[PDB]
Design a binder for this molecule. Structure first.
Ligand SMILES: O=c1[nH]cnc2c1ncn2[C@@H]1O[C@H](COP(=O)(O)O)[C@@H](O)[C@H]1O
Ligand SMILES: COC(=O)N[C@]1(C(N)=O)O[C@H](CO)[C@@H](O)[C@H](O)[C@H]1O
Ligand SMILES: *Cc1c(COP(=O)(O)O)cnc(C)c1O
Length: 804
């Protein structure tokens, strides 16, 4: 494969030399007892050596040049594995492949040893990771800042058809990429009280937790740029035994990632994590600023991007530093703060927005609450000046929410304290200005923007689908890898017989490889000559895995009704993690496995239909299953999925999409042409009209015989004979408390699925439509998204110029 680079003779020689050297000196092993794991580590250290010179030169270059610095703060960075990504970005893949082969090893088998760095829940976490990759590739002096969790998202086991959570001890064998930096450890304060003297305010009597940074290299695509991701680790400050044991209390701050996707859990520990990242990060930012070329120019030299409201405390924290410590007058400090910060909102689901009770804030961060109240007062003074007499607007826009439990609306704080606020897909950003943040948009229309998400073509095409990346390069070269819009050139081949044959060959190759993986690793057998119908994403009610479930049972029931009637064979795969405390999501996973239990063992169905639940869906699994997918399920209720990103890996990897007009699905359909998509169901307007007159699930049940049959099968125990009432909760929700209107999209979804099967019956036309999708996926590269952030928000110009 040409996109994988050269395997120079000297390079290969040197690599084998360093591989053996590391096995000896670093791993302290000898070939006779070395395990595949040992070899994986020897290769990883060998590959890591190649990043060092560039890492040092890059950071040195920024200190010398002093460009504006981009600080991307996030509580999640779902990086996945690093070995292949590093070889790809450094053009070492073929060289290492040859070197390892000459050493009698299979590089791919070695790659399977590496643990996914799973410091993320799903979309938002992965976006942070794609963004890091694009910022480096675009030559931006960007710094990823987060927290080094000891345990990322739990490993999902399925036992008896149910999800079981196991700690994700990803650091057991170490992390060869990161570099501990204990020398740059910083103090973070908690609790305490505030004193107002003659020098202003003073935060005193605080408890200290130390933040120790660990730096990870972030390589751009062959431009010799290696940026940094700095993750903070909590350390206790500098009878007796119990006192030493109690050091765990402070160190617990960075122990584990809260496993919630699109759900706010107001736990004090989570608040600590948020302030922890923010306080330490901002000390780094101020220090760099001071040793650069004073505060008037701070915004010209610093950009702080908030990945949702998670690190929103950065606003009052910056004000605290500027006012309490640097002694800037409030007004000036605020001007600087707003010009420095920008907020990215990723959801409209109300239960996902952060609203911290004021008592928690008053106790844990007394000075920050005082600063927040002052920010609010001045902000509401401006609202009042702009809309005199509009008292309810004041109440609505306030950073303070009034109930039994007074809370602080973190999103309102972010809008008030940021010069830019953006949504993550056109429809979502428009919805923001129309509903949720309408008052704010009216007060400051210019603050509001859109930055449609993207995914990186390196990990999500070149790494995961080398076969596809190769046939594409065969026709248009390699420029598209960091200029995805060039994929448009592929429209010239919709009628090219060789390309049509190869696109289909590549997909079938991936399907065989994926089938081999499931047999080997999970001992699951799937029919390779079936349509691979895939819905992989976190289990949620709004994502409607349940709708997928209704369809699957429909397919089963239709086959049983007319057994001799031909149907396009399908392997329906659903995978994803459920937050541990999310009851319905866990019941849904169980229904999925229970459906398979019946469907997969009915002799009449045979291999015409199979339903499997893919265990432990994570980034590394996404890289295997997405390239093998024929149909991509993106069926959230219109208006609920802010953007989605899995939708865009599927499109880029040759799968056709069946989905609603939600999030970026809208833009995806627009780019490819609705005739090349399988859009169905209610649009946002329809959902609202239903909400206006009231959603009554009974009407659909009463009017659709096939739906009725399925609900009665669930309620009577057809999918749980030993426990007839097992799914009563799902049925009750669907029939009476379905916020996401599953029944309302059932008929159109089943009809749309019929249309999917019809096209699949025509391999040639299925493939030509696929080509029209791949060819128009360019807009969804994260390089485009990031270039937009740079020019429209950060005020810096991206660049593809190589470093020496
Ligand atoms: O005072 C200094 N003298 C010379 N080089 C420096 C100095 N401070 C930082 N650097 C260089 O700039 C890099 C950037 O460090 P940082 O951005 O503060 O993490 C350092 O690793 C050094 O190469
Ligand atoms: C707190 O809000 C979120 O986490 N929002 C989400 C997500 N759950 O991943 O963010 C990602 C990245 O923007 C979006 O693609 C997705 O539709 C949205 O739901
Ligand atoms: C991309 C990705 C997600 C987000 O997928 P959506 O379908 O947009 O929710 C979640 N998990 C992993 C492992 C991903 O790679």
């Amino acid at each position: 494969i040409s996109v994988r680079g050269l395997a120079g003779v000297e390079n290969v020689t040197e690599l084998k030399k360093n591989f053996n050297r590391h096995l000896h000196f670093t791993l302290v092993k000898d070939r006779n007892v070395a395990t595949p794991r040992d070899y994986y580590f020897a290769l990883a250290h060998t590959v890591r050596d190649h990043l060092v010179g560039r890492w040092i030169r890059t950071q040195q270059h920024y200190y010398e040049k002093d460009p504006k610095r981009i600080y991307y703060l996030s509580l999640e960075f779902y990086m996945g594995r690093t070995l292949q990504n590093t070889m790809v970005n450094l053009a070492l893949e073929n060289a290492c492949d040859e070197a390892t082969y000459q050493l009698g090893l299979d590089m791919e088998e070695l790659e399977e040893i590496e643990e996914d760095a799973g410091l993320g829940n799903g979309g938002l976490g992965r976006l942070a990771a794609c963004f890091l990759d694009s910022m480096a590739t675009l030559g931006l002096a960007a710094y990823g800042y987060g927290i080094r969790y000891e345990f990322g998202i739990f490993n999902q086991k399925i036992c008896g058809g149910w999800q079981m959570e196991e700690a994700d001890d990803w650091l057991r064998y170490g992390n060869p990429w990161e570099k501990a930096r204990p020398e740059f450890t910083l103090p973070v304060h908690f609790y305490g009280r505030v004193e107002h003297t003659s020098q202003g305010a003073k935060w005193v009597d605080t408890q200290v937790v130390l933040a120790m940074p660990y730096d990870t290299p972030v390589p751009g695509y062959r431009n010799n740029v290696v940026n940094t991701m700095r993750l903070w680790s909590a350390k206790a400050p500098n009878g007796y035994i119990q006192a030493v044991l109690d050091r765990n209390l402070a160190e617990n701050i960075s122990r584990v990632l809260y496993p919630n996707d699109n759900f706010f859990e107001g736990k004090e520990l989570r608040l600590k994590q948020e302030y922890f990242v923010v306080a330490a990060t901002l000390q780094d930012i101020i220090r760099r600023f001071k040793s650069s070329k004073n505060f008037d120019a701070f915004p010209d030299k610093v950009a702080i991007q908030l990945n949702d409201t998670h690190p929103s405390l950065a606003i009052p924290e910056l004000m605290r530093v500027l006012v309490d410590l640097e002694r800037l007058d409030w007004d000036k400090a605020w001007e600087v703060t707003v010009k420095t910060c920008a907020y990215t909102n990723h959801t409209v689901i109300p239960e996902a927005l952060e609203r911290w009770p004021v008592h928690l804030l008053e106790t844990l961060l007394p000075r920050h609450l005082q600063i927040i109240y002052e920010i609010n007062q001045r902000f509401l003074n401006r609202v009042a000046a702009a809309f005199p007499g509009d008292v309810d607007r004041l109440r609505r826009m306030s950073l303070v929410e009034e109930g039994a439990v007074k809370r602080i609306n973190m999103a309102h704080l972010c809008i008030a304290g940021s010069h830019a606020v953006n949504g993550v897909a056109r429809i979502h950003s428009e919805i923001l200005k129309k509903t949720i943040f309408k008052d704010f948009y009216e007060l400051e229309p210019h603050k509001f923007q859109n930055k449609t998400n993207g995914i990186t073509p390196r990990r999500w095409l070149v790494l995961c689908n080398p076969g596809l990346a190769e046939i594409i390069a065969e026709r248009i070269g390699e420029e598209y890898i960091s200029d995805l819009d060039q994929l448009r050139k592929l429209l010239s081949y919709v009628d090219d017989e060789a390309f049509i044959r190869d696109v289909a060959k590549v997909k079938q190759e991936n399907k065989l490889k994926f089938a081999a993986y499931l047999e080997r690793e999970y001992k699951v057998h799937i029919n390779p000559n079936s349509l691979f119908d895939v819905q992989v994403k976190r289990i949620h009610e709004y994502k409607r895995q349940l709708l997928n479930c209704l369809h699957v049972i429909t397919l089963y029931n239709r086959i049983k009704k007319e057994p001799n009637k031909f149907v396009v064979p399908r392997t329906v795969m659903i995978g994803g993690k459920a937050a541990p405390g999310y009851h319905m999501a866990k019941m849904i996973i169980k229904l999925i496995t229970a459906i398979g239990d019946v469907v997969n063992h009915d002799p009449v169905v045979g291999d015409r239909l199979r339903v499997i639940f893919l265990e432990n869906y994570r980034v590394s699994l996404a890289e295997k299953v997405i390239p093998a997918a024929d149909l991509s399920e993106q069926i959230s209720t219109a208006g609920t999925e802010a953007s989605g990103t899995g939708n865009m890996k599927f499109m880029l990897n040759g799968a056709l999409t069946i989905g609603t007009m939600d999030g970026a699905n809208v833009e995806m359909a627009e780019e490819a042409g609705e005739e090349n998509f399988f859009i169905f169901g209610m649009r946002v307007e329809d959902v609202d009209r239903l909400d206006q007159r009231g959603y009554n699930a009974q009407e659909y049940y009463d009017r659709i015989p096939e739906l009725r049959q399925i609900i009665e099968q669930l309620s009577s125990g057809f999918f749980s004979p030993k426990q007839p009432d097992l799914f009563k909760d799902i049925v009750n929700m669907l029939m009476h408390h379905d916020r996401f209107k599953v029944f309302a999209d059932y008929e159109e979804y089943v009809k749309c699925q019929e249309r999917v099967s019809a096209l699949y019956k025509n391999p040639r036309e299925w493939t030509r439509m696929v080509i029209r999708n791949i060819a128009t996926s360019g807009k969804f590269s994260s390089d485009r998204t990031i270039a937009q952030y740079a020019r429209e928000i950060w005020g810096v110009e991206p660049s593809r110029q190589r470093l020496p």
